[PDB]
Design a protein around this ligand. Sequence first.
Ligand SMILES: O=C(O)c1ccc(-c2nn(C(=O)c3c(Cl)cccc3C(F)(F)F)c3cccc(Cl)c23)c(OCc2ccccc2)c1
Lengths: 260, 259
Amino acid sequence: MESADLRALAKHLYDSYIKSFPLTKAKARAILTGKKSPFVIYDMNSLMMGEDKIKFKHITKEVAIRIFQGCQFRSVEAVQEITEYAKSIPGFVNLDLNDQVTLLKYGVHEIIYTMLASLMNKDGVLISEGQGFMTREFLKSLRKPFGDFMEPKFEFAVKFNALELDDSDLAIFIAVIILSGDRPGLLNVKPIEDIQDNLLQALELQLKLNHPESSQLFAKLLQKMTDLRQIVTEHVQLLQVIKKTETDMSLHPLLQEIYK
Amino acid sequence: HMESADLRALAKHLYDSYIKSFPLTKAKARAILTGKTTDKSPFVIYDMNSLMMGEDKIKEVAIRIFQGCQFRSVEAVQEITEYAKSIPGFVNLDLNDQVTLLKYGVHEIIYTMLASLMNKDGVLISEGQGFMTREFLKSLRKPFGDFMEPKFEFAVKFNALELDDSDLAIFIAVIILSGDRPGLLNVKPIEDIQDNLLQALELQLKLNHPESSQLFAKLLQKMTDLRQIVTEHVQLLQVIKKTETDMSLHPLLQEIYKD
Ligand SMILES: O=C(O)c1ccc(-c2nn(C(=O)c3c(Cl)cccc3C(F)(F)F)c3cccc(Cl)c23)c(OCc2ccccc2)c1
């Protein structure tokens, strides 16, 4: 593609990314740096006040279970936001419908983890559209396997945030993830990889212009897709352990279906 | 950041060392595999009897073969270790980090280079004098049948990138100098080296495959496929250690797999 076309693709994706995701990384960074203070959850009692004063709809049973399930609720919300964003990626909706479903099915976890880093620092994570802040330490100290469920996310985020990407960078990176041609069961790989090459071209030029001093940032960001795949695999295995161990997890059958 | 002429110098250096360190190059392997040559033709092993005739021309069957791969993996580690010492800056790192970069890097490199010896139907063995079919491996008993097929599945996809040896010399280097390995003491000097290696690989791929659009990015995404195969392999080994009480690993391989 010609350079002026890549910038156009980058601008298109940035605009769409702003419309699809309410809490941007720029905004999140303002809140975390202390630059209306969020409600802070750092222990059990502040949690009990947090739901009462600000209605957390992911957390309206044991506390560590409540919190785990609340993360499920929000992940379901995020999936719909990512699905709307993907439709704005040039070429996506023209793909075979089964392939569109397949790309989203296997991609959303990688994107959720990526975008969750925009809401985290080394000390905690923004929640409920940025009105709250849950500390890392409180999450880490949740009992039995739930404590060891949240920390891998922080560990990735700390490393990922060291790249210092902004929203215009992330908009293209997110697009690149969705258009992965190696997803199982794809019917027509060719147009998927063709779009990804254009997106990779766009991301490469974006990083060079926006971070001229950051040598081989393109390569370094692509290496992070190894960290994502591995963390997604780990996550899936942790779920299986909870399903086979915890007698206290069942929800309403309808809710179980929603969270399948 | 480096100058273009400096990066070409680094690529030539690494290609030269790779030729010195690895006796069975991809160019040679493909000449043997593509045939048409009466002097380089391998003996083909596809079943029990030809395996038995193979020993003339070049315990239980699956163990013998598994032990054969263990032996060759040890040799490969020795070759990779020698190559790594030639990577500018590697020998100047903290010794513990040198050991750590090799601990986690050798397998990812072994599977990369094993692809050079593979096609969809089998793999070259014994310095290219032999060829073991995929199906014969897949038909070995117990957990051994399922041991090589993941590698074949990777190689088919990886070989579709059509890299040659001069490309692989830099890619192998980029893998070793990974700053995200667990337990590294000084990540920064490792990452500075990798930046120059990545710069070198980027320019090398552009010059050597000018029509192969975004080959650089596509090659880096393959480093994800490598990580998954190493995990899968290590889990299979653990199963055998708990099932075959009489079976033994090389000290070198034994230490590599500790964590
Ligand atoms: O605003 C957002 O975009 C967003 C994105 C991700 C998370 C989040 N997800 N998550 C997972 O376990 C997870 C992941 Cl990574 C990916 C896929 C599926 C899941 C899940 F298993 F939950 F189904 C977390 C684990 C630890 C910490 C967090 Cl913050 C998460 C999120 O939590 C909001 C929240 C947290 C606690 C209580 C109430 C709400 C918000």
